[PDB]
Design a protein around this ligand. Structure first.
Ligand SMILES: CC(=O)N[C@@H]1[C@@H](O)[C@H](O[C@@H]2O[C@H](CO)[C@@H](O[C@@H]3O[C@H](CO)[C@@H](O[C@@H]4O[C@H](CO)[C@@H](O)[C@H](O)[C@H]4NC(C)=O)[C@H](O)[C@H]3NC(C)=O)[C@H](O)[C@H]2NC(C)=O)[C@@H](CO)O[C@@H]1O
Ligand SMILES: *[C@@H]1O[C@H](CO)[C@@H](O[C@H]2O[C@H](CO)[C@@H](O[C@@H]3O[C@H](CO)[C@@H](O[C@H]4O[C@H](CO)[C@@H](O)[C@H](O)[C@@H]4O)[C@H](O)[C@@H]3O)[C@H](O)[C@H]2NC(C)=O)[C@H](O)[C@H]1NC(C)=O
Length: 361
């Protein structure tokens, strides 16, 4: 099984214990670590943070400890305008230029592959995404003639039915990608006036309307569209999404005034790292959606939807039962990486819980 794990560039800037650098990563935890995110300048892949080349080097020395470890560099991401990807992909010349610049960059910095995080392709982009993937892979196949191990090509893909139908030719790109990471954790929160869980495993008969917004539907759909299970990787979040309640009602459907109050370390309204949730739980009431099989918690007027060791292990068994290639975790720096916030003196409790299940039959 594969355990794909993301590490984010900007996590180095968090204060105190929240600060996370690549060397905090256990070399034997994941099978693949992906550095997010690279930028595109003058139609060429490029660094993003001022100290990326140094962090690239720090991440890749982990391979001196675990020679089996593979690293990839992800381009795009949420703060990368998808229109920018559009412009590059729609013109054969700017597209060829970008593709040509990738291998030498990856080779210079020690990466084993490229991860595409175009979030998200539109109806007019579907055709060009296919072209980009095809041609990128053809270039990787050609570069390997030089005697070096062929570069890996992956892509992070939306798990929303409508987003998939609109921007991706799943049957086509599946043939060229080494693996596809399903973003099965962005099913709610996204500017909605009600409380709900962003990463439910199952639909849950109670309130059948967002019948498509659960991991089980996304996986089944991808398999139906033509993607092989052995190339599919299910996304598991290491963060939670928060809401400020508009009323004293805490159960399903309850009013919401806006995103939750920022975490002390992550400082982003609406999000909380797992290590911040561990702290939040003290004095909170915990609940669990039995149908969806994921927990949530409340304290005062704050409502948090998250994943714990139990729900994460549950998702890992589900993916094994459907014979998928493995799991993807977003993100290592959001898990209790120091292992000092969540109690049991365990480093990376969430990611480790997933690894344990994956290591069983
Ligand atoms: C669940 C999850 O992980 N969500 C992410 C989402 O958060 C990502 O967006 C990221 O959000 C945070 C803010 O919420 C951004 O953090 C800033 O990152 C920049 C670097 O890109 C930092 O700039 C640097 O600042 C330090 C000072 O501390 C200087 O030393 C650096 O030199 C300076 N860079 C220079 C010189 O220009 C800044 O400190 C961070 N401040 C914050 C707000 O914490 C983060 O950048 C941002 N990511 C991006 C790419 O914009 C999102 C990513 O797209 O993905 C998920 O949705
Ligand atoms: C990620 O890559 C992006 C490029 O694809 C990049 O986007 C931006 O790139 C510049 C960085 O901020 C930004 O620069 C502004 O452009 C002006 C003119 O283009 C520039 O003035 C001139 O500067 C020198 C001469 O002094 C000249 O050589 C330049 O060509 C330029 O004409 C302004 O002072 C200013 O620098 C671009 O506007 C912007 N482009 C886009 C995509 O809109 C990101 O900065 C890169 N990395 C990140 C975000 O960290």
């Amino acid at each position: 099984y594969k355990l794909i794990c993301y590490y984010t560039s900007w996590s180095q800037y968090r204060e105190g214990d929240g600060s996370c650098f690549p060397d905090a990563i256990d070399p034997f935890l994941c099978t693949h670590v992906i550095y997010s995110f690279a930028n595109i300048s003058n139609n060429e892949i490029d660094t993003w943070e001022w100290n990326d080349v140094t962090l690239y080097d720090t991440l890749n020395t982990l391979k001196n400890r675990n020679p089996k470890l593979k690293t990839l560099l992800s381009v795009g991401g949420w703060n990368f305008g998808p229109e920018r990807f559009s412009a590059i992909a729609s013109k054969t010349q700017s597209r060829r230029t970008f593709i040509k610049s990738v291998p030498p960059f990856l080779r210079t910095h020690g990466f084993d592959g490229l991860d595409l995080a175009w979030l998200y392709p539109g109806r007019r982009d579907k055709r060009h995404l296919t072209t980009l993937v095809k041609e990128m892979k053809a270039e990787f196949i050609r570069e390997a003639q030089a005697g070096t191990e062929q570069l890996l090509l992956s892509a992070a893909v939306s798990a929303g039915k409508i987003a998939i139908d609109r921007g991706y030719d799943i049957a086509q790109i599946s043939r060229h990608l080494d693996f596809i990471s399903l973003l099965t954790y962005d099913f709610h929160g996204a500017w909605r006036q009600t409380v709900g869980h962003h990463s439910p495993l199952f639909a849950g008969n109670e309130d059948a309307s967002s019948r498509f917004s659960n991991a089980d539907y996304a996986v089944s759909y991808m398999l139906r569209l033509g993607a092989p299970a052995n190339k599919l990787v299910m996304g598991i979040p290491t963060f939670g999404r928060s809401f400020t309640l508009a009323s004293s009602k805490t159960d399903v459907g309850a009013p919401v005034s806006g995103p939750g109050v920022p975490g002390r370390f992550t400082k982003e309204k609406g999000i909380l790292a797992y290590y911040e949730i561990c702290d939040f739980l003290h004095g909170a009431t915990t609940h669990r959606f039995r149908d969806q099989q994921v927990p949530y918690a409340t304290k005062g007027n704050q409502w948090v939807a998250y994943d714990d060791q139990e729900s994460v292990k549950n998702k890992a068994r589900y993916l094994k039962n459907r014979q998928l290639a493995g799991a993807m975790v977003w993100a290592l720096d959001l898990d209790d990486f120091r292992g000092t916030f969540c109690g049991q003196n365990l480093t990376f409790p969430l990611t480790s819980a997933v690894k344990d299940v994956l290591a069983e039959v």
